[PDB]
Ligand binder design. Structure first.
Ligand SMILES: *[C@@H]1O[C@H](CO)[C@@H](O)[C@H](O)[C@H]1NC(C)=O
Lengths: 285, 183, 128
């Protein structure tokens, strides 16, 4: 039996005849067959709910049968996890005048391999203009994320790979995806946002460059940007539809913790896109 | 039911309890404990079984600040057991550190502070030196321990307190002030 | 630092029921404490707690306000570790043990308490 050398992505196996599939854990006695991987065509067998944990250090046996004879291909006992490479992540886009939004999740969502490690992904990507091909490389992003400072009616392209700062392990790239930012926002966004405290209550102000705009202000827990699956910006009530370039509200409004903020301009007909975002400790003194 | 207070007094951990709304009150009490991290049987704590007094010295029993302790206190009067309360404790959070006994002696330019220790935690010692409204923290432990506050001056009243500090966030329990002028 | 003290309190506050009534369901998970320079094991350790208490299953078990304050502490903890920049395999297997325990227990209320109290030990161990 001459041994075989196999790599892994997510919940799959990849070889590099028709085939069959066995393993015996280090501490081996018996030999069990993973369902659906016996007498199969392809060189990749998927095992979600097939194999209980990928954290053991196993040994594999492969039955390769060409015509009337079946060869024996062993596999040097490995640990699945140590070998596993992150599958291509899933990418979802939403377009703007000057900006793009990214929603991302592991390909093979609910992957048995990933299990828990998933809420912990760092993503990194490279994006560029469609024709210019100027690639701004951006590493260390979070599961869902927004990109600013772009030109309207313009097609940008990109591919994303996942990474886990955790195990040195880093992943394969998504397919490239492109979109063309919409025509420039008629009402531009409020722009430089700053927050302060006075006595006990709270106040923030922005620059909307037009007179007679209202502004619907929203907040988000800061940590929720790392949690891609299933997420709601809540609006700040004292500030809902205010008539001026600042609005206020008291200390007790935010419990201690870490939040995200954004601001919007509207003339009541065509509203504007959102301002850029910001975070704060809920602690100062 | 019953309220449980856990304190550490001069290097020993004293678990104590008080009862809320009990008409028939117990004569003899028995306290038991185990931890959550392993399925071990409740051990009765030796010295605290069928004691009259409401407090138990658990110093030799509860070594680690890294366990969730579950206690059950039973009380009897009669051919009768009357009831048994349970409660849980995390030493690093629920504990309270009582201040050491101490003395001071004023000398010409300095003070001898003798902290009486007898002969398990990450605790820090702070000897406070307070005078003219001004407080200094000193952070310099078996048997009697002496600490000298030096660079002191004649004819100036100084007031001193000592306490043990686990974490800054958790509250600190200070000794009473003891005060003297230098000779 | 301040995060551990203020984190354990949150875990401590989250308790929904008597530990005495859950004693039956206790179980030794064999946390690999010798693992506790070390940063890579810690980031691994936490990222698991976050991603563990973030399940739809965890959300049904605990107070949302506490859970939240909790995520917030760990969120800041991960950035701190992110910044600076086998053991994990063992730390990961451990969480495999935990995940399995809850399943078998059908996430019973007591089964959740057995785990909460266990994480407080795991965490406190790794912090000192
Ligand atoms: C984008 O440019 C690429 C080459 O970079 C080309 O293949 C593609 O057809 C272009 N798309 C559009 C809509 O211009």
């Amino acid at each position: 039996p001459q041994k075989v050398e196999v790599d892994i992505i997510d919940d799959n196996f990849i070889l590099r005849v028709t085939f069959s599939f066995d393993y015996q854990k280090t501490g081996m006695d018996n030999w069990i067959k993973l369902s659906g991987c016996q007498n199969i065509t392809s060189t990749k067998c998927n095992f979600s709910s097939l194999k209980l944990n990928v954290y053991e250090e196993i040994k594999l046996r492969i039955r390769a049968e060409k015509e009337n004879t079946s060869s024996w291909y062993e596999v040097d006992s490995f640990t699945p996890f140590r070998k596993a490479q992150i599958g291509p992540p899933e990418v979802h886009l939403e377009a703007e005048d000057k900006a793009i939004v990214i929603h991302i999740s592991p390909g093979t969502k609910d992957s048995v391999m990933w299990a828990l490690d998933g809420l912990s992904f760092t993503y990194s990507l490279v994006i560029w203009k469609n024709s210019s091909g100027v690639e701004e490389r951006i590493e260390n992003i979070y599961s869902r994320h927004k990109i600013y400072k772009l030109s309207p009616e313009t097609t940008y392209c990109l591919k994303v790979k996942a990474a886990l700062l955790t195990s040195w392990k880093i992943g394969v790239y998504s397919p490239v995806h492109c979109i063309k930012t919409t025509v420039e926002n008629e009402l531009p966004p409020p722009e430089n946002i700053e927050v302060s405290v006075q006595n006990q209550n709270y106040v923030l102000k922005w620059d909307y460059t037009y007179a007679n705009m209202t502004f619907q202000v929203q907040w988000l827990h800061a940590f929720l940007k790392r949690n891609p699956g299933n997420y709601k910006w809540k609006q700040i009530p004292d500030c809902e539809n205010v008539k001026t370039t600042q609005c206020v509200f008291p200390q007790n409004v935010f419990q201690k913790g870490i939040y995200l903020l954004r601001v919007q301009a509207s003339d009541g007909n065509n509203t504007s896109f959102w301002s850029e975002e910001i975070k704060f400790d809920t602690e100062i003194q | 039911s019953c309220t449980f207070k856990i304190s550490l007094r001069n290097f020993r951990s004293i678990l104590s309890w008080e009862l809320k709304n009990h008409s028939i009150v117990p004569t003899h009490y028995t306290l038991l404990y185990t931890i959550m991290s392993k399925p071990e049987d409740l051990k009765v704590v030796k010295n605290c079984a069928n004691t009259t007094r409401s407090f138990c010295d658990l110093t030799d029993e509860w070594r680690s600040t890294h366990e969730a302790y579950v206690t059950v206190l039973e009380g009897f009067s009669g051919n009768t057991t009357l009831f048994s309360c349970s409660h849980n404790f995390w030493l690093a959070i629920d504990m309270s550190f009582e201040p050491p006994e101490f003395e001071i002696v004023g000398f010409t330019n300095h003070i001898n502070v003798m902290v009486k220790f007898p002969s398990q935690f990450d605790l820090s010692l702070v000897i406070e030196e307070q005078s003219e409204g001004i407080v200094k923290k000193h952070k310099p432990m078996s048997g009697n321990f002496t600490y000298i506050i030096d660079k002191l001056i004649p004819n100036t009243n100084y007031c001193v307190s000592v306490y043990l500090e686990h974490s800054d966030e958790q509250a600190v329990i200070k000794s009473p002030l003891k005060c003297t002028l230098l000779p | 630092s301040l995060g551990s003290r203020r984190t354990l309190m949150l875990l401590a506050q989250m308790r929904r029921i008597s530990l005495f009534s859950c004693l039956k369901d206790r179980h030794d998970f064999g946390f690999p404490q010798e693992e506790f320079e070390t940063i890579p094991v810690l980031y691994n350790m936490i990222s698991q707690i976050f991603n563990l208490f973030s399940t739809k299953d965890s959300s049904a078990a605990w107070d949302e306000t506490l859970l939240d304050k909790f995520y917030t502490e760990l969120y800041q903890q991960l950035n701190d570790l992110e910044a600076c920049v086998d053991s994990i395999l063992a730390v990961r297997k451990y969480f495999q043990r935990i995940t399995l325990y809850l399943k078998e227990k059908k996430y019973s209320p007591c089964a959740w308490e057995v785990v909460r109290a266990e994480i407080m030990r795991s965490f406190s161990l790794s912090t000192n």
